[PDB]
């Protein structure tokens, strides 16, 4: 089993693109299936737009259409990449100290933005155009936890979000660009900002002991909002409006040090009758899948009303098949 | 008599500095006398420091201090430069599209801005190192024109974006302490101040009747008043001790109508009414202003700060002579 | 995740040594943090000096400086080599059955001592050099004898009977001021005058047999933390009964090895930590956990009411 090094769903949580050491895979969600691989070597980052056949390959910058089998460009940086995402309009590469965006759609450069030094490589980009907005942190070269709000459009930045007092851990911005949640380096404390006022909307606590966090994502209806950290377990928390809504438990076979990023489907009908779930023939049950780094993705089922712990259902594996 | 290319006063608004295509020279005000002059070459931007024997001198850059006649540094840019500032920590040049920030003291560079396209060379440098502020606008790359960035030279790195005006920002200027920033639309009609902690605009000032080109703007001292200076051949005064202006500066109507016209405003002093008969006791202070003008000419005035009004003018020099 | 071999702290306890089948890391404490790390191969004993720069690797003897990337000098033994401790002026290498001591500056030889078998490598150093001592079991070929052995002119000074069994771990003030002992049965400890011999202090733990893994003292010496097999941590102050205690997580890996070391007392912000904890700031002393899984456990003592401590983080080492 080849030693895998980047996970990230699409931008609308329907696809699974991956990276290995020795290439990289692109998987599907709802009828499971591999729709492309390709053995090169060792691949960093992986990056895929709404479906439609284009990548971003970091070898451990390379754009290819992989329906095709051509490639569009290639972008050499000075330093080494750290994060790159997407939407239908502009495209974002990041490194320690430079930003860099370009147009996906004639890929000359379109702005360059010096900021301080992020060794984590954080970022958070709206995918709808509509809203297309950037965010990113602005350390000192207490004011630990600044992040400015970028708008790509226009090209300006548009209000500083005094968002932590450390330094900040984790960021996502929902799919219409409306909303931003932010945590910092102890994931005690996620706070929620509106991205077009910047007063904060939502703070939910996470955890009782500080714990380090993975990655933040929103719900496609920006209902819920899901947290990954060290300690095995995936909090939701519920932005219909604190405490977690529902939780997710791995089984407990599964190796404590994983990475994990999950993400939250639309609500589907399932089954009672065959699953007893402890009765209507069906009910909607609002899926979640989670991916490990150790080469496994799990299904999990919540209740909008009743939340909780939440069932499993399934259980794949992402590397052999 | 050479043309002059560059007028602006010192950081503390007791000194002259002055560019002509010969050469420069450096003045001073209340013992008025010529401490400093070189036949070199044309010059286009000569700042001074608070005294302490410091330039900053740019061809039609080189840092040269005038006691010793030696040259402290060297420096060469990829396009020309439009605007320098100090302060007694920070060193600032602008090109079009560029910010480079250098500590005064090490001369080593300490960051870069990448700003939209600034042909008017406009920026705004507080002098105190308590508030090390410097604003520079930000507009739309190609109805938000007039957006501009406050950005903090001592943690380098920007604190909020200010939604000045809804035209292109013409001239900026900080008050001596680094609390306060006025800002003028390319009509001239308008004059607002925000306070740049907060970010609130405190006081919105009317300038004149109809719209007309602003030259340039400054503060007090003391921070009570803030003069401006347009085509009209007027000069305002405007109270921030908080609309219309305050007072009014009517220059001798022989002068010139193109002549550019900078300003500043002194501490009150103590004058003899037995000589002038302002229309008493013997003496009363009177706040004194200095307007030097394109041509070459140096304008003395008085305000009374109860009764503002017209000022009187007292007496002219001829800088070049 | 490749398992690792080697996991100590730094003689002031502000780092973590710790070295791998693949290679070896330093990381930081309060500021946490990967500062140095290599993969050049299978380290069984990586130590390091107070900061400085400078390590001594044992495969599974090299000393080498992490700043200059340079190799002082190596050394080779007839057996394996057990334990290593270092202080500002002497290198002591333990082996089965002989000990060696260095000049830490020279790298000369100083001298050897022929003790007998010491299968646990246990030894024990004053890190500081206005006290350097050094003390050592001394099984009969009277069971609980340690060596005081002066380093500073190279001459045992005296010889204490600790405990009647078999001594178990060891450990030696900053200041070199007071030696402490547990008997391989695990339920009493035994405070010492390293200078005069006498017993001061006698501590009551492990009430059913878990064996005492290690023991280390402040660096103020105001409390003393054993480490045992029974997945909680006991502190006793040297100011009977302990005094504090802590309960690592239940979801942890219980085939572990456990040490812990406390720090200077610090200040802790409330805000930072909502669910739990919840002054602004409280003067609580940091002890830190870090056991052969993989995890440092940061956890705070009121120094009034002690009690069973809370737990502020837990980080992942090996990433």
């Given at each position: 089993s080849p030693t895998i090094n980047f996970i990230n769903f699409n931008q609308t949580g329907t696809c699974i693109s991956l990276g290995t050491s020795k290439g990289f895979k692109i998987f599907n969600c709802?009828?499971?299936?591999?729709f492309y691989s390709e053995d090169s070597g060792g691949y960093a980052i992986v990056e895929m737009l709404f479906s439609t056949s284009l990548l971003a390959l970091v070898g451990i910058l390379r754009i290819i259409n992989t329906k095709k089998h051509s490639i569009i460009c290639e972008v050499t940086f000075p330093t080494s990449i750290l994060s790159v995402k997407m939407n239908k309009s502009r495209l974002v590469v990041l490194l320690q100290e430079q930003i860099y965006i370009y147009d996906?759609?004639?890929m000359r450069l379109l702005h360059t933005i010096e900021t301080?030094?992020?060794?984590?490589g954080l970022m958070a980009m709206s995918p709808s155009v509509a809203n297309s907005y950037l965010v990113y942190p602005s350390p000192p070269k207490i004011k630990n936890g600044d992040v400015i709000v970028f708008?790509?459009?226009?090209?300006?930045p548009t209000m500083v979000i005094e968002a932590h007092?450390?330094?900040?851990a984790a960021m996502a911005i929902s799919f219409d660009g409306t909303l931003m949640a932010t945590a910092s380096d102890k994931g005690t404390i996620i706070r929620v900002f509106?991205?077009?006022?910047?007063?904060?909307?939502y703070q939910f606590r996470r955890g009782t002991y500080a714990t380090r966090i993975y990655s933040i994502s929103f719900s496609e209806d920006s209902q819920y909002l899901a947290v990954t950290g060290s300690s095995k377990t995936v909090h939701i928390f519920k932005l219909g409006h604190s405490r977690h809504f529902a939780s997710l438990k791995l089984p407990?076979?599964?190796?404590?040090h994983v990475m994990t990023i999950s993400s939250i489907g639309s609500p589907i009908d399932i089954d009672t009758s065959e699953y007893p779930?402890?009765?209507?023939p069906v009910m909607k049950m609002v899926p979640i899948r989670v991916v490990s780094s150790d080469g496994y993705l799990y299904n999990f089922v919540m209740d909008?009303?009743?939340?909780?712990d939440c069932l499993i259902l399934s259980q794949y594996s992402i590397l052999m098949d």
């Open positions: 709802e009828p499971f299936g591999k996906i759609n004639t301080n030094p992020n060794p984590r708008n790509l459009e226009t090209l300006q007092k450390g330094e900040i509106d991205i077009e006022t910047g007063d904060k909307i407990v076979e599964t190796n404590s779930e402890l009765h209507e909008p009303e009743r939340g909780g």
